[PDB]
Design a protein around this ligand. Sequence first.
Ligand SMILES: Nc1ncnc2c1ncn2[C@@H]1O[C@H](COP(=O)(O)OP(=O)(O)O)[C@@H](O)[C@H]1O
Ligand SMILES: Nc1ncnc2c1ncn2[C@@H]1O[C@H](COP(=O)(O)OP(=O)(O)O)[C@@H](O)[C@H]1O
Ligand SMILES: [Mg+2]
Ligand SMILES: [Mg+2]
Lengths: 327, 325
Amino acid sequence: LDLPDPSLKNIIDQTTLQWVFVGGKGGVGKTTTSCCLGVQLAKSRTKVLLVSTDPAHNLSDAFCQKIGREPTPIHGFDNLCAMEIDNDVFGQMFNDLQNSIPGIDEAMSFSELMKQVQQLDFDVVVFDTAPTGHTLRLLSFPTILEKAFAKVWELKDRFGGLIGQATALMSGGNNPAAAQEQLLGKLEETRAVINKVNQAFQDPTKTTFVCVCIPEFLSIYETERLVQELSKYGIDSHNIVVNQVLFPEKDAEELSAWYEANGATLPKEAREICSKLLARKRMQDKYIGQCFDLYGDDFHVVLMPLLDYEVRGVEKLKTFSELLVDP
Amino acid sequence: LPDPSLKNIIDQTTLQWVFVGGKGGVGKTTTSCCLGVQLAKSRTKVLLVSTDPAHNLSDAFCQKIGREPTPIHGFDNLCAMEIDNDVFGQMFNDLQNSIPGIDEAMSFSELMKQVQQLDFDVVVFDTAPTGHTLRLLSFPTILEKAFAKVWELKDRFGGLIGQATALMSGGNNPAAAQEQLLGKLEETRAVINKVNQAFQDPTKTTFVCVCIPEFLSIYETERLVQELSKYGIDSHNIVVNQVLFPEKDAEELSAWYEANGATLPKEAREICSKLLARKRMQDKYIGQCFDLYGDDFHVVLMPLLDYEVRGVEKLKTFSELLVDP
Ligand SMILES: Nc1ncnc2c1ncn2[C@@H]1O[C@H](COP(=O)(O)OP(=O)(O)O)[C@@H](O)[C@H]1O
Ligand SMILES: Nc1ncnc2c1ncn2[C@@H]1O[C@H](COP(=O)(O)OP(=O)(O)O)[C@@H](O)[C@H]1O
Ligand SMILES: [Mg+2]
Ligand SMILES: [Mg+2]
């Protein structure tokens, strides 16, 4: 067959990329893939930043080094930084909006993060995103903002009488109408930031998504959810990383023939372990064929081997990254 | 105008659920406990349920209150209660991430089922602050949206789900897990449909809105009243709590102070001026309350006291003021 190269080298080749998002469900290897992409990009690019919005602090455990809320340089690199991230009328109206429109706080946090990152001045940013479910809401942010605007408008419409009647009483910093206009302005600031950011995100020159999974149903199902959602929102993805593949080198036909020929020559325990490993290989192959049915025409499908050790520490990450970019 | 008491709540012997709402700190818990104490007289069995996040019921009654009906010391028929790989788990987590509030709707569904099977004559609900109670009102919409989401996912990924069902044998069937999630949504929706049908019946359900003579409290009260009206839920009782001497009008003390202020020692002068300023402000907001309501609502004015209304006797005296002024 001829197909895209089964590596992430196309990411390194596209030198114009400014945002690389790494997605997938929990435990498939998002953080490892992100760290390896950062290590590889640090070669050609002037400055590379890794941002983790996954709730835990997995970045520190990955690099075996404490990572701060602001760009922490990585030991062994000069141009690789990492960063991990977790009376008053206006206050009441803002609280009411937060309770009414779930997700507006996430949108404002993401807006603030984008402002801070875009002012940090880096050549490329790799985002270790949260598990798929949370990233899908991240994608829905424009709808969340539109509903928040509609709520504030409905609120003005429905309670203008009370708000105007109260404006005459309370002096100083508690004019209700001014508080409503200020809440509109904060929503407007958030929406403008997110619109500029989304314009950059819909440009395949600057932004692409790497989807990580493992050869099991739930991982591939969440990958398909993410791929379709990204396509819906015009965000480019052309890389699937299938992680933790049980020895991708050898073929199930080959080892099945060997086992059917030579199983009874093995002690019972070795025979049982070989049989279990073969069944696991067959199942994984079923799911990898499913991946190539869904993708492969339009995606670089990278197969990564299951290792005995956790991929922590700089040297391990470098070896894994080399497997990632040229197998 | 309607009588300035909550006696109409006691008179309507058909009431099954009385919800008490309002902003934080306005007196929801106090009013709920007092309504329960008063209802325990006419009704055979009365239950107080607290969905307020904190454990304020225990502090109110000065007694630890349990997760299931705890009888109240001094009462024979008044109980209170305070309230806190895997394909199915993954799909439910996806739904929780997609439809925020579905878990709250299911928790409320289970709570309502348990309450309806405890079989009480009347239940008084001390709700959480207004913002959360409004979402409670939106729960049926959230359930419909969750159903629609699971069906959209079923439609779009049926191919993948069935192809994986063919692979993994025995249990952990993804299609069965999706049908199981639909069935759990259906259970929840049936409970909440019964509950909402009871909520829209003024014979069985009414809302008491608590506020204080301040702008924000009245604003949240108006939000709550309009939301209840949208959803066909009855409210005809406003409790304005912590009123600074509700009997007298600020006019009298204003005339007295403007005449005789400088003849007072410094401390008396200062406290009198502070009290007068607060009373003037409170009177503006109480006039606002009577503008908004009073035509259609029983407006109960309750005095601000020096002590916190904790303990059974405090609750009894406050309840007497609440139902017969
Ligand atoms: N190819 C692999 N083989 C063996 N273990 C791996 C592999 N890739 C990642 N791991 C380990 O699995 C754990 C989960 O990986 P991580 O990148 O944290 O996943 P995620 O970020 O998607 O939750 C990590 O401790 C990592 O060391
Ligand atoms: N009329 C009143 N005078 C003085 N204190 C009061 C009055 N009503 C309530 N309190 C006190 O104010 C506090 C808040 O009341 P609570 O019923 O807990 O409000 P909510 O439940 O709405 O937050 C309680 O400690 C209560 O004892
Ligand atoms: Mg991660
Ligand atoms: Mg309370």
